[PDB]
TrEMBL record:
Keyword Signal annotated: yes
Keywords for the protein's UniProt record, in alphabetical order: Signal
Span of domain Leukocidin/Hemolysin toxin: 34-281
Any single biological process term in GO: cytolysis in another organism
Protein name, UniProt field: LukF-PV
GO CC terms of this entry: extracellular region
Length: 298
């Protein structure tokens, strides 16, 4: 589905006006949904428009439960990495001026507030600040066992955030990761027990003991702040891409003990939306949307 709310105009102070529009789009098939808040800022003392764009919504992990009847060897897909990107095109006068989170973060919950100040200054602060005086937008997301890092393509026209498995505990053992190595037991991140008597399909860490991001959903909350000189072209393009990367975890009984293995990037599911931004009218229009997945199931 797709939807765009009419513009919401609010006078922040005597000099700054907020023009807010919420755009949504999703893939029912991929269980990926985007909730984008376009906060256009207009300030009488600055000759550039400011757009504080919040990207939120949902990204299913892509997890598949292993068949409990599997004997000898079993396997499952799990969400190993999430990528959220925002890029600007079709207007050389539109630049990325700030974004949050700004630095690597492995805290269990990320909470920040981006604020706009008279003059065009963008400030940042930890935690969920006010609401208010002045305009501000917050980011709030849980990522237990995962780590946020900036995409290496982040530059003046593109911002990206990678949220990847980082320290996964298995019954007090770990922390494990996508490449944990053990000469005898392989990658034991989600292995049940080395001498388990159960079927292969039942010898995996209990679903509720796995991180929410590995087997459930990731609810991203990111902010990209862009600027545009007011004398430049009136329109531009904003592309927002939400993606989940899946790894295949496996187990195998070798006649003596269990062995676990993790095969990275076995599948990717992505939902992308392209919006035409009218900076003069503070409105957005969906240009197109694409949803894709190259190697589903198992």
């Amino acid at each position: 589905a797709q939807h765009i709310t009419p513009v919401s105009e609010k006078k922040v102070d005597d000099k700054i006006t907020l023009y807010k529009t919420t755009a949504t789009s999703d893939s029912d098939k991929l269980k990926i949904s985007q909730i984008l808040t376009f906060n256009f800022i207009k300030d009488k003392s600055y000759d550039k428009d400011t757009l504080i764009l919040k990207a939120a919504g949902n990204i299913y992990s892509g997890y598949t439960k292993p068949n409990p009847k599997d004997t000898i060897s079993s396997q499952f897909y799990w969400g190993s990495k999430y990528n959220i990107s925002i890029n600007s095109d079709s207007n050389d006068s539109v630049n990325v001026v700030d974004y949050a989170p700004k630095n690597q973060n492995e805290e269990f919950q990320v909470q920040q507030t981006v604020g706009y100040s008279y003059g065009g200054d963008i400030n940042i602060s930890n935690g969920l600040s006010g609401g208010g005086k002045s305009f501000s937008e917050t980011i709030n997301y849980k990522q237990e066992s995962y780590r946020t890092s900036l995409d290496k393509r982040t530059n003046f026209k593109k911002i990206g955030w990678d949220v990847e498995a980082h320290k996964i505990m298995n019954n007090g053992w770990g922390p494990y990761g996508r490449d944990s190595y053990h000469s005898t037991y392989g990658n034991e991140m989600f292995l049940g027990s080395r001498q388990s008597n159960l079927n292969a399909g039942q010898n995996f860490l209990e679903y509720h003991k796995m991180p929410v991001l590995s087997r459930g959903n990731f609810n991203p909350e990111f902010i990209g702040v862009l600027s545009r000189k007011q004398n430049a072209a009136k329109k531009s393009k904003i592309t927002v891409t939400y993606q989940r990367e899946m790894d295949r975890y496996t187990n195998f009984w070798n006649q003596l003990h269990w062995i676990g293995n993790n095969y990275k990037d076995e599948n990717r599911a992505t939902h992308t939306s392209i919006y035409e931004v009218d900076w003069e009218n503070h409105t957005v229009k969906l240009i197109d949307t694409q949803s894709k997945e190259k190697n589903p199931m198992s």
